Every structure is written in structure tokens, then in C-alpha cells.
Symmetry: D2
């Protein structure tokens, strides 16, 4: 079966993509990572030795190498990578013009993924594999009031095109999920200060959350399993672009 | 109360926006138009003399003048216009490089709306009113396989900015609804040939339809009722941009 | 030699592209069109029976069929089309919300080109030929104060992608020239009223004109002569995108 | 006179903007920075005590604080900042999927500027000042083969909008210069390996360089001197957008 790495799997669309992968195919193996062990254990308990995980922050290169080494050690190869920064959540000082906070958010949403692709790339070359990015719909970047939360998340869009131009033995695609990726579980509101999210950002964020997926998760899952078509290699698309019709449920 | 014109009201998001307007405010009057009389009658029967309609094709200027004259005759003014081309549906020969079919689709999705704005503009100037466009999310125009269906629909985006620059006594905004606007009622599939939609377009279209709103309808409805903020005049935004937090449910 | 149709050849970049085509290759034949006969005669006098023209408005389908028939009659085939709406110039009432003036500008900048592609398409299929659009740089459509002048001109961008998806035996590309295409000859200022161009548009227009090409003309000319690469088929790019390095002087 | 900080002043458009500022106004003082002292000395020798500089890398926060402290010490205030990453040049390993090289380029083109704005912001608030970014035209990001060179440079576009939303006592604008900013002085070609620039990037780069400004430099200079209009605060525009007509030569 295909060996697929998936990041950001604790919540939101990353969790759904794991769920969908296992329902689509009986042979696929998934190695996931998230920062919290609880939901990784729950996935391991549900899916058994179809699922393996590393716990930690992918802004640590050591965590990335653990995850890549664990897949090659345990199953001998890597077919695909579903590169996902995970759900939107408030991060300290991002609503300020604060280079330290911006660098930290760009490392969460963009550079850790660049680092992971670089680390996994030699295995992906071996299988002529696929890199599927879970990017953001906020390509209305045109106008966006999401500040650094939006620009850092959307940086994967151009990255897909650059990776596919530069590395011809692999394919890459960036797909927007038609929603703002948030934790879907009913949660107590958190006390979020204005240096972290503007009042508007917080109010929309809560609205969206208190409103929120299997359909776009399937698109990502089918691209990772069956491969990216040549005609969309390098591109960034909504999950509902007609060029993706064969990757729908 | 505010006098609001709404187009494309038979189905999909245009119908929802009428429903939402009436639930938000007891004083608002709406003049709608759609090509089919059945669902207009049903709206008239539900809402009584809060709702008035004209039946016909807004690619006819006579229909536009009827609707504008009827609002000024019946209620003396027009406060806002919700300019909506209505739900996506197959149109003959659009999937061919056929200038006649493209002109006809651009008249449906774009020029009829330009014509309506021009016709209503002198009344809107009188009340310093608002023009709210129901535009498309397929601002991933960047990449889009929706052919002319996508480009014609999205032409309202730049139009908002041009109208707000050129006409300072009115405000305008183009808001994407976070979905592809389709008829939401359970329908028999229609036999659609390849000159009208590619196989991919048809397969995605059916998927989307067989999957499909009150939340984005509220944003449009609250913009039309309360007015467009100065800071977003002229712009094109997703319904879930934080600058629109105060227009959510 | 290759048989190439070129529109908008009287002035600006369209004229340069003809000049460049003839300097690159001794075998190429060009059929051009422009509305004014004077500069067409001058091209015929300079290049002789390498150049043929039709005089007229390409918003007339009869002019389009004349040009296509003349190429097939005179040289038996058509290899490439350089689709160019020609230089920016004031057009009546475009700076008003006036559907008639907008339709007329969209026919000049967009629909006549759609019509021409449809008319020439069966000959282009015969030679697996190339459609090169001279599109606008004002893909900062993101923000643009050029009103309808900008949106109508830029409509070729999405059209390239749709044509290349729909017609697999041909290739298409839309290339921005890195300038606003204007008449380069020293001219008396024309009296332009505010319904035609805002004061700002007119002042920038004159500035640009009084400032204004062989380099981007070469890119278009080399794409038409040598063919569009598979990796850029369907795309819209600046003339200076690195994927076009081999089409530079 | 106005006190204006300008970065990237050794070459290309940043140097031109200093030249233009001094020719426009006899009272303006400029504090510039560049990594090489030679061309800073030459500017100091030409303009005398109208010009002050710090030598160093603005990816060093100490250099940024020196420059800001020097302006407040020497002239008591800061009116405007022209934030410019400087000319395109090959940087090691950027044409590889190499997170270290990408972070270093993003610090050069984006984070150092974020850091500078944060550092200067309290002085800019005092004078209700202006932040003018020299951004890239490669907003055809839509399609771009410039890899990380393009995406890192263009990150200033969204940053302008976020800064102007978040800091209401200042104005900000990002303006594209209508050219790829390169060193304009006739130079020996440098031996550039493929890990630094693809063959295509290098070939276009040399072409552009061997081809390459006072007009767009004036736009930036006039925005910094006279202030950013309310109607374009927060936006990203080409230097030739009509909303900028009053900032032309």
C-alpha cells in the first residue's frame, strides 16, 4: 500500500483527511504528527498498525527527521506527503507589528513545511511521489483583514508552483478547502487579547468556529492516494475546481 | 423602512437574502425579480405587502426600468440594491469558443447588472445608498477550470471598485459567499451536453448541488440594511473577512 | 514559412511585433489588420509580399472572415495568431456607468478576439498552431483605477487558460508586455472629456504616452514563430517571467 | 523639512529615489542605509548635510536601531520611511528547497522591513507619517517562475494593508515600480551556479540587467514627501495606476 505522511492531524481538516484515507483504501499506511499526544493515541487506538505517529512541533527539524526516519524504517518508503499547518488558533502578538511573532507564525504555517518537504524529498523522489498542500481559501489575499494569519498560511500557494518547477521527479499541488480550517469540537471560548487577534478577527473566528469538510478532505486524500494529474501539477486551486472532479467523494 | 431591490431571488443565495432581510427588520420593503413567476408568487404569499416583484429577464432593459419604476412609484425611493446574477446553471454552447454564447453569458452575469446599476443610480444617489454585489468565490480566478461560467460571474469584483471610485454619493462592495451558488432544492439531473459544460464541469456541478448559506445571506442582508463601511467601500471580500464581522448573524 | 495573423498592427506593440517577426525569419508571412489603412500601406510598402492586410474594425465578423479567408486563399494555412486589441485610447462614455459604452469596449478588447479565435480555430487545429495574446500588465487588477479600460483589456488572461483547456490541438498563452500599450509617435494632446476618462486617467495616460518595447515584442514574436512550451500552455505571464527566457532577444 | 529614512540606497531604484527626493525639495533630509559604504560616501559627498547614512545589513536589528536613533538624535523626528529591500541579486541555495536559504531571503526581502517598521513606528506615530514600500511588479505572482526571489519580495504587498489596518495614526502603501529592480551600472557577469538561480532565472536576470526609472522613483519620492492619499492607504498599486497621477514627474 501507499505510505503517506500527514501533518496537522490532531484537529480540523487534517484529522478528516486521515479518517478519509483509511476509509478509501484497506492497504494505505499513514504516519501523522501533531503537537498534542492525546488525539494521536486516539487515532492509533482506532486504526491500529495502519497508523503511526510522532508527537511534537514541526517547527523542530528533529521532529521532522523522526517522522521521516520512522516511515522509512517501518515501511521502507514514502509515497506522498499531505502538508498541512493545521487549524487556525490565536498566537501571541501576531496582531502587532512584531517581527518575532511574525517569524514564529511563518515558521508554523510556512517554513516548517518547507523544511519537511526538503527532508522528505529524497524519499519522494524514489517513488516519484506527490506533495499535496492544505492551503487556505484566503486567496482572497487580494483583500484580507486576517493580517499575518492569512499571509503566512497562503504562502504555500506559490511554494507548490516553485517546488513542482524545481523538482521534476515529484508532483505538487496546493488546494484550498472551501472553509477556514478550525477546530470543529465544541469548545469553551478562550480569553484572547488584542495583541493576538484584533476584535474583528476574534469575533469572525468565533463565528466561524461556532459554525464549523469530509468533501474537501476526500479531495486531498484522493490526490495523495492516486497521484496529482499532470495538468494541475504546480497549481493552486479550490477543492471544488472542475479539474479536481475525479477526486471528489 | 429601507427600500431594497434584490435580483436573482428565485433560488439559492438570492432567495435566502430576501428571507433574511424580512427576519431582520419589520419595516424593510423588498422589490425582487426572477425569470420564473412561481417562486415570486410564493414569496408574495409569505411576506405580503412587504414584498413586490417583477417577472422577467434582467438582460431586458424594459424589465429593469419596470422594477426601478415600481419601487419609486410604490414606495417613493430606493435605499439599496443587492445585485445578484442568480444560481449557476448550464447555458448552451458556453463550453465552446463561441462569441455569441459568451456574450449571452456575460449579459446574464455582468452587463445586466451594469445596466441595472445605471438605471437605479439616480435614485441611489438621492438616498446615498448602497450597492451590494453577490459575486463569486472563484476568485481563485488565478486558476479556474470553470471557463466562461467563472470569468463572467467574477467580473462584478472589479466593477464594485470602479463604481465606488466613479460615484461618490453611493457605496459599493462585492462579497463572495463562500460557496458556488446553486439551486438547493432536490432536483432530477438534467441531460447536459458537452458544448454547454465539459464533463468535469458537469460532474463538479452535480457534486456541489447534491451537497448544498443563511450565514453569508445575512452578511449581504446586513450590508444592504445598515450600509457599507467606508473602510470597505470599493472592495471585493469573502463574506468571512474579519472587516465584515459586524454583518454576521 | 509560418503564416501568422496579427491584429492591432497600426501602432504600439502590435506594429513592433510585425517589425520583429520580419527581422527574425526570412520565410514568415504575416496577415495584419488595423482600422486605419495608412499605416497598413506603409507596412506593405516596406515588407512587400511578406505582408498582407485587411482594413477594418475587428468588432465586425465580416472583417475577421476576410482576414482568415485571405490567409488561407493566399498561403493555404494559418500557423499562429497574435491576438492584440491594440493601443489604449479614450472611448466615449467609458468613464460612466453606461452599459452601452462598456459593451462596446468589451467588444473592442475582448469579444472581437474571442470571435477571431473561433473563426481561425479550424485552421489553427490543422497546423496544431499557437494563439499568443497581447494582454495587459494591469494584472494588478487587484487594485486598478483604470475602470473598464483595465478590466476589459485583462479579460484575455482567463481566456487563454479556458481556450487551452478546451482545445487540445492548439496552444495558447497570454503575455503582459511590461508597459501600458500606447501610441509611441509624438502626437498633439486630444481634448478628452470626463465621461470618457477621469481626470486622473487622462493625466496618467498622457504621462505614459509622453514617456513611451522591441524586447517584449520579441517574446510575442518568438512564441508565434517557434511555438508555446507545454509548461506554459494555458498560462498568463509577464514577458519577463523566467519561463520565457528563450523567447527574449 | 521632512525627515525621510530610505533603505536599499546603494543601487537601482533606491538610489534613484534619494536622487529624486533631493531634486524635489531643498529642505528634506534623508537617512539611508546600504551594506556597502562606497556608494553611501558618494551620496554624502554629493549632497552634504542633507544626507546621513548607516553602513550595514538591515537583517541586523542593531543596524536598524542605529539608523532610527541617528535620525531622531540628528533631526529630532522621522516623517516617512521608504522601505526597500534593494536590487535583485543571486543568493546561495535559493534555487533549492532549502529552508535555511529561504529564511535568509525572506529576512532580506521581508522580515528586516517588518523589523524596521516596528522600530520606527513610535516616531512615525508622532508625526502621523507615511510608510512607502518599494514592492515588486511580480504581482503576477499568479504565475511566476522567480521561485523564492519573487514570493519573498512580494510579501510587502499584503504587509502594507495589514500595517495600515493595525496602525491608524500612520499611512502605508506598497507600489510596484514597473520594472524588476536591478543594478543599472554596467557590470561583468558573475559566475552564478544552479543552486542559486535556475538557468532560466539567470538568463532572464542578465537580459533584464543588460537592458535597464526616474519616473517610478518620483512616485515613491512624492508619496514620502507629500503623504499618501486616504483613498489609497493600505493598498498595493503599480506606480502607473491613475490614483497615483499626482505623484508622477
Amino acid at each position: 500500500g501507499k505510505v503517506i505522511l500527514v501533518t496537522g492531524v490532531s484537529r480540523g481538516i487534517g484529522k478528516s483527511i486521515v479518517d478519509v484515507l483509511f476509509s478509501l483504501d484497506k492497504d494505505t499506511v499513514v504516519y501523522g504528527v501533531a503537537r498534542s499526544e492525546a488525539p494521536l493515541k486516539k487515532l492509533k487506538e482506532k486504526y491500529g498498525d495502519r497508523f503511526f505517529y510522532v508527537v511534537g512541533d514541526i517547527t523542530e527539524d528533529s521532529v521532522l527527521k523522526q517522522l521521516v526516519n520512522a516511515a522509512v524504517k517501518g515501511h521502507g518508503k514514502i509515497d506522498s506527503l499531505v502538508a498541512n499547518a493545521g487549524v487556525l488558533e490565536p498566537v501571541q502578538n501576531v496582531n502587532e507589528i512584531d517581527v518575532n511573532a511574525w517569524k514564529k507564525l511563518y515558521d508554523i504555517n510556512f517554513f516548517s513545511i518547507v523544511s519537511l518537504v526538503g527532508i522528505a524529498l529524497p524519499e519522494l523522489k524514489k517513488t516519484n511521489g506527490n506533495v499535496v498542500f492544505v492551503s487556505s481559501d484566503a486567496c482572497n489575499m487580494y483583500f484580507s483583514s486576517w493580517g499575518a494569519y492569512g499571509s503566512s498560511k497562503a504562502a504555500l500557494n506559490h511554494f507548490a508552483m516553485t517546488l513542482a518547477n524545481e523538482e521534476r521527479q515529484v508532483k505538487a499541488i496546493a488546494v484550498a478547502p472551501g472553509i477556514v480550517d478550525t477546530d470543529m469540537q465544541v469548545n469553551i471560548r478562550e480569553n484572547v487579547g488584542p495583541s493576538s487577534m484584533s476584535a474583528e478577527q476574534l469575533k469572525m473566528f468565533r463565528g466561524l468556529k461556532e459554525n464549523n469538510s469530509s468533501v474537501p478532505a476526500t479531495v486531498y486524500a484522493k490526490l495523495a492516494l492516486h497521484g496529482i494529474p499532470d495538468g494541475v501539477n504546480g497549481q493552486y486551486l479550490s477543492y471544488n475546481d472542475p479539474a479536481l472532479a475525479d477526486f471528489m467523494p
